[PDB]
Chain A
Amino acid sequence: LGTRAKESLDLRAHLKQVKKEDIEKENREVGDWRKNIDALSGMEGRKKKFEG
C-alpha cells in the first residue's frame, strides 16, 4: 500500500511539476496597457485634413 501511494504521488507530483514549470515560466505575458488620460489641454492644430 505504501509503495502504491508513493508511486501515485510521484506521478502526480511529476505532472504538477511539469505543468508548474511553464506556469511560472512565461507569466509576464499579462503585461498590457492601461490607457490613462491627460485631458489633452494642449492640442492647437489646424484644419488641413486631406488625408481623411
Chain B
Amino acid sequence: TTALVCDNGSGLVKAGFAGDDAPRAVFPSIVGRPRHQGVMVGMGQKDSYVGDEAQSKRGILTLKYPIEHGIITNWDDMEKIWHHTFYNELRVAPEEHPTLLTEAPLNPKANREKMTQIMFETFNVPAMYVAIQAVLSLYASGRTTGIVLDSGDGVTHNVPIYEGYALPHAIMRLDLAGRDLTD
C-alpha cells in the first residue's frame, strides 16, 4: 500500500500520500473553542473547530496552537488535530497506512515517545517512522551534501550534512521563527 507522509510542523499541517509533488491538504493547526454564550438553539454548534474551519469562524473563537516551539505542549489538542487530518482531510483510515512524521532536531525525548505511543495505540497505524526535518529538505533539493537552514514557524535549525554523513556536533538550533516575527 501507500504511505502517509504527514508533517506536523507548527503553524501549518501538511499531509499527503507518498509519491506526489505537493501535499494534498494544507491547513493551519489551530483548535479554537467558542468563548461567548450562544443563544440560537439547534444551530448545531460544536465544541471545538479545528483546522481550516476555525479560520472562518475565528471571530467568536479563541484559537490556540497546540505546538509552541517544535515541542508539543497540549497533547489532547494535537490528538484532535491528527484525527481531523486523517479522517476529514484525507479520508483514509490509519489502520491500513504507514506514517512518516517529522520532528525538529534537539527536541525533548518525551515528545517523540508520546508521539509514537499515540500513533500506535490510538490511531493504530501499521508502522511509523520519525525523521529529522532538515534531512528531508536536503532530499528535496536532490543534493547529498550541503548545510540546510530550515527556518520554520516554530523553530529555526541549521543541520550541516556531508556526503550523507550528518555532523551531530554542528547542529545549531535557534528558537526565533515566524511566530516571534508575527508578535
A residues neighboring B (CB under 8 Å): 47, 49, 52
Majority secondary structure, B binding face: loop
- Interface bin, chain B: under 10
**In the assembly, what is the distance between CA of A18 and CA of B180, in Å?**
81
**In the assembly, what is the distance between CA of A47 and CA of B20, in Å?**
12
A-chain residues with CB within 8 Å of residue B142 when the two chains form the complex: 47, 49
Can you list 5 residue pairs at the A/B interface with Cβ under 8 Å?
A47-B142, A49-B139, A49-B142, A52-B144, A52-B164
**In the assembly, what is the distance between CA of A52 and CA of B164, in Å?**
9
CB distance from B162 to the nearest CB of A (A): 14
Interface mask (B139-164 → A, CB under 8 Å = 1, otherwise 0) = 10010100000000000000000001
Which residue of chain B lies nearest to A49 when distances are taken between CB atoms in the complex? B142
Which residue of chain A lies nearest to B139 when distances are taken between CB atoms in the complex? A49
**In the assembly, what is the distance between CA of A52 and CA of B138, in Å?**
11
4 closest Cβ contacts across the A-B interface? Answer: A49-B142, A52-B144, A47-B142, A52-B164
A-chain residues with CB within 8 Å of residue B139 when the two chains form the complex: 49
B-chain residues with CB within 8 Å of residue A49 when the two chains form the complex: 139, 142
**In the assembly, what is the distance between CA of A11 and CA of B142, in Å?**
66
**In the assembly, what is the distance between CA of A29 and CA of B144, in Å?**
35
**In the assembly, what is the distance between CA of A47 and CA of B21, in Å?**
10
B-chain residues with CB within 8 Å of residue A47 when the two chains form the complex: 142
CB distance from A42 to the nearest CB of B (A): 19
**In the assembly, what is the distance between CA of A52 and CA of B165, in Å?**
13
**In the assembly, what is the distance between CA of A49 and CA of B141, in Å?**
10
